[PDB]
Amino acid sequence: DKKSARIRRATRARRKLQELGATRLVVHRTPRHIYAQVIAPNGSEVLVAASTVEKAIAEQLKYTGNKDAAAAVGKAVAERALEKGIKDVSFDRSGFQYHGRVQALADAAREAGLQF
Amino acid sequence: AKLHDYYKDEVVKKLMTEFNYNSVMQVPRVEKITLNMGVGEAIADKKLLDNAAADLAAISGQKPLITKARKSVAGFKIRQGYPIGCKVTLRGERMWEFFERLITIAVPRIRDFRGLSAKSFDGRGNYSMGVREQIIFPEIDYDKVDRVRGLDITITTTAKSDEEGRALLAAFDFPFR
Amino acid sequence: MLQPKRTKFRKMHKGRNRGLAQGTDVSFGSFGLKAVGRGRLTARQIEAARRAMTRAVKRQGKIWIRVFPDKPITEKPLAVRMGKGKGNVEYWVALIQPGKVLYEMDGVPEELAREAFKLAAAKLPIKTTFVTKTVM
Amino acid sequence: GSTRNGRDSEAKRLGVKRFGGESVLAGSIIVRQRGTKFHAGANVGCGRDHTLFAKADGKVKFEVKGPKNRKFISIEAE
Amino acid sequence: GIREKIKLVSSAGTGHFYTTTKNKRTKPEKLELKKFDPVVRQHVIYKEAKI
RNA sequence: UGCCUGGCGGCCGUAGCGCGGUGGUCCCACCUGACCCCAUGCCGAACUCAGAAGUGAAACGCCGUAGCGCCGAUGGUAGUGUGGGGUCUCCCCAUGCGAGAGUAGGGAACUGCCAGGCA
RNA sequence: UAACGGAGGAGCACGAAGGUUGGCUAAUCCUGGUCGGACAUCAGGAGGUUAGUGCAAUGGCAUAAGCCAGCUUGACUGCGAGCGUGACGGCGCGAGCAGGUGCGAAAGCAGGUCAUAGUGAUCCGGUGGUUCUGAAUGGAAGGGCCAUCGCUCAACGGAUAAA
RNA sequence: CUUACCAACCCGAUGCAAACUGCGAAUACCGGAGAAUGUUAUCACGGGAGACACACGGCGGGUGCUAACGUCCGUCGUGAA
RNA sequence: GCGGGGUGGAGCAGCCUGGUAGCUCGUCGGGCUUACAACCCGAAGGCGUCGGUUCAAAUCCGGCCCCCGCAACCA
RNA sequence: AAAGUA
Ligand SMILES: [K+]
Ligand SMILES: [K+]
Ligand SMILES: [K+]
Ligand SMILES: [K+]
Ligand SMILES: [K+]
Ligand SMILES: [K+]
Ligand SMILES: [K+]
Ligand SMILES: [Mg+2]
Ligand SMILES: [Mg+2]
Ligand SMILES: [Mg+2]
Ligand SMILES: [Mg+2]
Ligand SMILES: [Mg+2]
Ligand SMILES: [Mg+2]
Ligand SMILES: [Mg+2]
Ligand SMILES: [Mg+2]
Ligand SMILES: [Mg+2]
Ligand SMILES: [Mg+2]
Ligand SMILES: [Mg+2]
Ligand SMILES: [Mg+2]
Ligand SMILES: [Mg+2]
Ligand SMILES: [Mg+2]
Ligand SMILES: [Mg+2]
Ligand SMILES: [Mg+2]
Ligand SMILES: [Mg+2]
Ligand SMILES: [Mg+2]
Ligand SMILES: [Mg+2]
Ligand SMILES: [Mg+2]
Ligand SMILES: [Mg+2]
Ligand SMILES: [Mg+2]
Ligand SMILES: [Mg+2]
Ligand SMILES: [Mg+2]
Ligand SMILES: [Mg+2]
Ligand SMILES: [Mg+2]
Ligand SMILES: [Mg+2]
Secondary structure, eight states: OHHHHHHHHHHHHHHHHHHHTOOEEEEEEOSSOEEEEEEOTTSSOEEEEEETTSHHHHTTOSOTTSHHHHHHHHHHHHHHHHHTTOOBOEEEOTTSOSSHHHHHHHHHHHHHTOBO | OHHHHHIIIIIHHHHHHHHTOSSGGGSOOEEEEEEEEOOTTTTTOTHHHHHHHHHHHHHHTSOOEEEEOSSOBTTTTBOTTOEEEEEEEEOHHHHHHHHHHIIIIIGGGSTTOOOBOSOOBOSSSOEEEEESOGGGSTTSOTTSOSSOOOEEEEEEEOOSSHHHHHHHHHTTTOOBO | OOOOSOOSOSOOOOOOOOSOOSOOSOOSSSEEEEEOSOEEEEHHHHHHHHHHHHHHTTTOSEEEEOOOOOEEEEEOOTTOOSOSSOOEEEEEEEEEOTTOEEEEEESSOHHHHHHHHHHHHTTOSSOEEEEEOOOO | OOOSOOOOOOOOOOEESSOTTOEEOTTOEEEEOSSOSEEEOTTEEEOTTOOEEESSSEEEEEEEETTTTEEEEEEEOO | OOOEEEEEEETTSSOOEEEEEEOTTTOOSOOEEEEEETTTTEEEEEEEEEO
């Protein structure tokens, strides 16, 4: 099963981040959409979030499942984070390769101000 | 790609009627075709494998993958990790073109051919057949062989039972007996 | 003579023999010979009692042996001093606690089972008693 | 005759060194073990021989956590 | 004990050396690694030599 | 506010299997292509990218159902600390602690944060 | 925690079998398949670690510590809060600090290897280094200090170089 | 076709284990808190030693034959004194 | 008790250290001879007994059996 | 040079 294979791929880095007490930037990617969440160190409270299933973000995009949508979510989640004064996070690729859409989201969040 | 069009424009409705599937994604598909050469003679002369792969490359138009022994076996004098085979996995367009070259050219050139068995199904709708001589494939010049070679052919199908797998292969006129 | 076909280890600590038995019901036949005392049953004893039992019922019915001699017993040979390692395995025993059903019988009348079990008990080093199957 | 046995190795003094609720300084060994019978929790490290040691001052705490019902040792800051 | 001791000599000309072992029958090629030379306080190339 | 879905957690079988049913606006999945970024010790299978015609078939979610797993008393029994006793290889008495197994029974999880769809 | 109690192993291996990043998941059986057989390679299914671990056994291991690949030398140098274990000599675990390094986009990880055997005090000397010493003085010899080498001293806390 | 037949696997039922464990005590041990009691009974450093042949009895065991006023450990008691 | 053994019909190599095992004689067929022997040609024929380890054992390991050689002592 | 027997 594809989802269980990815969850296995993601566990080692997630357990490391929990041990370090880091604030996580979690990314989730589907064929049609991409999602970003900034999660508190306890792992059970979401501080900010942005995705292509939101109207205000998806209205400005031709298609929600490409690198351009990824860059828009990356920038959006960073501005909302800095507005709450968060700044310092750790990137959690959630078992996806650091590449393509996932990388384009990360690059946009770095550019917009998030330190990782 | 011709046989692929044959599948989508005529085989689906034939099977949609014969088995009364409600969804079209229920229709059996041809997932992949895998060719295998068990070259157990390479442990004495590794160059024998280099020719067997050369044939499989010509027959399929794809670089073959040398396969290794999963464990040491005393009965065949092989240690774990010995290269003793070669295989090729065909999917998509290259699959269908080989599927066409096989039914309409290579199979009618079989020694004393009298139809393929219809009991060579594994129980979950996949078909396996053995070719005794590699000369049946026109990409093999009968004059440049150094040794006659067979192979196995497996057609892996997304069917659920043996009856649906034979129905799918029949719709392409698989030369059964 | 019963004896394990193979074992993990050749020799075994002496141990002790406290407690009451497990397996105190007639479970396979209708009549049983139950241990009242505590002790060891050698393989020769188990077999001597089996023979006496079996000849008394004229090899009719069925007989179960509920105990198996799985404990090896070592002995030091004569004129050997103390030390120099554990002795050699000489025979096999089963440890018996009070309540242990040792044999069971079926397919014969109760009067004959009583007589056959009496002849067998005379071969055994432990006090025994005749029991019958109970519904609960 | 003689025996073919008679050998043994020195005892290794493994086991729990600081029990639940004990106050420890950073660096203190909590348990010595072969392999991870106990796993490292918060503020606890796992050495190369799988020794669990305190990474901060505080109180030892044992707990069972996770999907495998594994035993974890952590240090509660005091 | 077939493995033999060898020394890895700094290429920085300081005379500093590390020591290790080597199976000279299976790997006769000279061992070469970049290691920290504490005399010049840099990582440099170190080359196998006799013990 | 209620319903449905996605993500991250708590918890770690009363929560897992099996069997039966059921869902596609959205979401999810399969899916459609691949010159490309990237990829196959062969294969666009997987990873990846560009997409949105089709289908909920598989998967997943939800609902149902004790065929299982799992949980589980009360009482008794085993063991045992202290003191005393006997016929002392083993037990008994006073007092304190008191299982395991089994029985009745329970049981088709519960829950926090954020987001989207619908009413 | 003893016995001339019950059972097995060591006196190594490895410049990758070490570091790191990314990926992966076992045994066994059943069915179908050229030569091909009980057992080779192929395909599907059941199964769920019954495999695997450089070598005994135990404790571990899926976030794998098991399998594959890319790049590499942290198998770094100086130190070390604190702790374990020893009569002692000693032996072990260790965050963190300075310098310099590898892998990773990054958080990070790396001071050898899943861990626990693979060993030998002191003396006497050998080799290289050295801002130390240098018997009137300048040198030198010799000595010190740092790195390293020589023992089945195995009766393994090692009476002698030699029974 | 047939078995004097043998039957592995799986299913059901019954036992056994120092080097078996999907369960699991009593005690013992480590740590914290509190009262009462006890001539500090605790720890550290320093002056002086003796001792390093133990014995039997109870309980838990290895060995021996659940032999020994036997032998070897653990723990308590007394003898030693 | 410590050693060493056990392999074609006989006597004996190989074992050590894992990957089908030899030699002499004997036997069988043919030839030479009036016939036999001698001689010549050609062929055939097998790891004491289990267990274990191992992908694989004549071989390594641990039992058991049969043989051999030393030792089984001081009062 | 080597040729035994009935
Ligand atoms: K199929
Ligand atoms: K359930
Ligand atoms: K490596
Ligand atoms: K590597
Ligand atoms: K002078
Ligand atoms: K000595
Ligand atoms: K005692
Ligand atoms: Mg006991
Ligand atoms: Mg030990
Ligand atoms: Mg796809
Ligand atoms: Mg469905
Ligand atoms: Mg209970
Ligand atoms: Mg259910
Ligand atoms: Mg003591
Ligand atoms: Mg002692
Ligand atoms: Mg990794
Ligand atoms: Mg590794
Ligand atoms: Mg390793
Ligand atoms: Mg190791
Ligand atoms: Mg001298
Ligand atoms: Mg000098
Ligand atoms: Mg001078
Ligand atoms: Mg000594
Ligand atoms: Mg206390
Ligand atoms: Mg003494
Ligand atoms: Mg003494
Ligand atoms: Mg004593
Ligand atoms: Mg006693
Ligand atoms: Mg005793
Ligand atoms: Mg005595
Ligand atoms: Mg006694
Ligand atoms: Mg005295
Ligand atoms: Mg004569
Ligand atoms: Mg004559």
